[PDB]
Amino acid sequence: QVQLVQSGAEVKKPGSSVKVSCKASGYAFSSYWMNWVRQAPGQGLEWIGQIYPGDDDTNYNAKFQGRVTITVDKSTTTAYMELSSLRSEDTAVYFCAGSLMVTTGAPFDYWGQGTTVTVSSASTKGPSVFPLAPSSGTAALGCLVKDYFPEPVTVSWNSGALTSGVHTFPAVLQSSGLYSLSSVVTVPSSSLGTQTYICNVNHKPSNTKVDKRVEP
Amino acid sequence: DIQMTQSPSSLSASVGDRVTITCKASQDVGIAVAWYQQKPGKAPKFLIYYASHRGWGVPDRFSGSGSGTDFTLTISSLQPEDFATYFCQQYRSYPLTFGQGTKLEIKRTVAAPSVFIFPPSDEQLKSGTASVVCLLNNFYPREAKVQWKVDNALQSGNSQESVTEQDSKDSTYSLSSTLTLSKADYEKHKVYACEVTHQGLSSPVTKSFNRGE
Amino acid sequence: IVGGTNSSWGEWPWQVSLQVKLTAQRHLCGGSLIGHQWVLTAAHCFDGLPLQDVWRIYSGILNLSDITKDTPFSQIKEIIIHQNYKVSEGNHDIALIKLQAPLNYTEFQKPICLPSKGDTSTIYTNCWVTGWGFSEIQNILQKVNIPLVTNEECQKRYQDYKITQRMVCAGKGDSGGPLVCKHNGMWRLVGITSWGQPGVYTKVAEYMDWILEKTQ
Ligand SMILES: *[C@@H]1O[C@H](CO)[C@@H](O)[C@H](O)[C@H]1NC(C)=O
Ligand SMILES: *[C@@H]1O[C@H](CO)[C@@H](O)[C@H](O)[C@H]1NC(C)=O
Ligand SMILES: *[C@@H]1O[C@H](CO)[C@@H](O)[C@H](O)[C@H]1NC(C)=O
Predict the structure, then answer these.
(1) Contact at 8 Å (CB) between A49 and A81?
(2) Coiled-coil stretches, from where to where (chain C)?
């Protein structure tokens, strides 16, 4: 089948460069335009450029011209996008998309799953986990995962034994440059005196695992 | 560059409803307009090209129309799988441009938020920072408003709000508000209150706690 | 990059369908729109059907099943078969059709650029043949990426037929259908299907002098 598989997520610092790859299969790689599109968390979709692998002809968005170089490797049928002089504003999910038509570059009938690129001067840091202790017929428990970088952080309650009513909110980038996240769950207030709730926080980028019990 | 403006930015509908999304180009793009569907965290999916023709395997309920500067996407009978963000793209001239996106949301009966307030934990205070969290649980619509009052003083610029996607079961939203204060500033005051204004509440609901109590 | 051999609207705007309405209208041959009034196809399509009154030509058409009595069509005004062509032989299988009324170029109807006189010796690497060939007639216009083969290498297989320098070899393809190859970022009509072993195509480059003279 037709597949576009991109490389894994990248974390870069300002002034460096990132090279995102897109391995294509299941079609005539050299006969279709390969387009690169990025989706910033707060600026929608933005077309970067395109390359026709057969002739290596390229068209770049004037915004990125001078910083993006789209190249292909016909042997492995892989397209690359190299964005240089990275800025924090370049943080976005970068997609490769194949043109619908052999004869023109747009529109795009198929997209890659996307490559998350995070540009930040911040350094890798494990999460500080704090409890959102319930007050005192549903009571709310929580878990404040704060000051971690890079994303993502996975939070589970009682090692998965408690999934009902669990809400893990999207992380927010703070002024410190670190991400913060809160995970909450609602349980009967009576059960607070019977059951113990454990916030299981895993941050693979830092290899840090935190298990914090939540009690009044 | 040709700008593409989609309307509305958000749109609530129910399974079986007929919904219409419009895209307006700042310049004449002829019919060189395509439509894409993107669900959260996934890649956009190709729906329409040349403003009217469906893509490979696109259900017939998806209909595109328009020409010149005004274009429309119509879904005759919304299926639960159709709720997602929709983008219009123009490829008349380079650089190719997309619309800001129109999010289709499941319409639900109004639900008032359950408001919870959490004082900063002792562990965090030892670190010199205080985070007080206000939780709005299982409410609809999304436009709940949250305000932070410190000793009846309306805080501003020191709070960040995060909201979840529609719950897969109840289609409700949940929102968290985190007022971040330094330990020095946290102890200056006594009463911390979270005031929530929502469509489903008769009057704003305020949950407060007294520091150290 | 999706769809396989199925084509998209406007992908091959030069593609035209030649049909005859004797008792039940059916598709017989493909053609290349090379101008407002000019269509280039294979001569053998007219063997036994010399009358211009019966021929209907459809441009900007993807799905032949969508053709209806209300569908617009072009009527032939002049059938210029190559003087050297003979029904008993496949050599010089190039014919020019003049439409009674000029066609308007649209997103679905555009001419295909013809090769220059000097392009008789150039080598093409990204070549495609499009048509509604047989398996019945495929409803959707098909596209196939086929590599070109040198005349010397081709003659080894068609031992029963003399492959002249005015022919191209390669190897869902109609008689008279286009053989287009992208060179220097521009698509050019390299050949015309004549024999449907490898496909054999009339080399449009060698016939440019005849094409321009008749056209002008
Ligand atoms: C092409 O379209 C036909 C419908 O006419 C369909 O049966 C076939 O599976 C399609 N092929 C591809 C590769 O999508
Ligand atoms: C082509 O048109 C016919 C009717 O004219 C329609 O039934 C068929 O589905 C069309 N082709 C495709 C691939 O849908
Ligand atoms: C087609 O071309 C003719 C002649 O140039 C012109 O009168 C007409 O407006 C054009 N468009 C259509 C839709 O016929």
Answers:
(1) yes
(2) none
Rounded Cα distance between C205 and C192, Å, is 11
The half-sphere exposure of C157 on its side-chain side, counting CA atoms within 13 A, is 12
**Strand pairing partners for A65?**
none
Q: Do B188 and B155 belong to one domain? A: yes
SS3 content of chain C, % helix, strand, coil (to 5): 10, 35, 55
B81/B42 Cα distance (integer angstroms): 14
DSSP C104: P
Whether residues B39 and B92 share a domain: the answer is yes
Query: Of all atoms in ligand 2, which is nearest to the CA of residue C67?
Result: 5
| Min distance C67 CA to chain A CA atoms (Å) | 23
- The domains located in chain A, with CATH, are 3-119 (2.60.40.10), 128-214 (2.60.40.10)
Instruction: Identify the DSSP state of A214.
Output: E
Q: How many A×C Cβ pairs under 8 Å?
A: 48
Give the three-class secondary structure for B77: coil
Q: Are A164 and A157 in contact (CB under 8 A)?
A: no
- Cα separation, C126 vs A130, in Å, equals 61
| Phi, psi for C140 (deg, rounded to 5) | -85, 135
- Chain C 102-161, residues with CB within 8 Å of chain B CB atoms: 107
Q: How was this structure determined?
A: cryo-EM
- For residue B180, the domain's CATH number is 2.60.40.10
Tell me how far the alpha carbon of residue C13 lies from the centroid of ligand 3, in angstroms: 18
**CB contact at 8 A, A20 and A52:** no
DSSP B80: G
Whole-number Å distance between alpha carbons of B146 and B134: 9
Residue of B nearest to C6 (CA): B56
Chains in contact with A, where contact requires at least 3 CB pairs less than 8 Å apart: B, C
C3 CA → ligand 1 middle, Å: 7
Q: Which of C25, C66, C136 gets mutated to test ligand 2 (max ligand atoms within 8 A of its CB)?
A: C66
Residues spanned by CATH 2.40.10.10 within chain C? 15-99, 117-205
Tell me phi and psi for residue A44, to 5 degrees: 60, -155
Peptide bond into A216 cis (omega under 30): no
What 3 state SS string does A19-58 have?
A: EEEEEEECCCHHHCCEEEEEEECCCEEEEEEEEECCCCEE
CA of C112 to the centre of ligand 2 (A): 26
Residue span of the structural domain in which B71 resides: 4-106
User: Which residues have any ligand 1 atom within 6 Å of their CB?
Assistant: C 3-4, 6, 139-140
Closest-CA residue of chain A to B124: A130
* Domain tally, chain B: 2
Tokens of A77: 């049928």
Q: Are strands B10-13 and B102-106 parallel, antiparallel or unpaired?
A: parallel
In the CATH hierarchy, which top-level class contains the domain C117-205? mainly beta
Q: Residue B155 has which token pair?
A: 């805080």
Q: Which residue has the tokens 């009044």?
A: A216
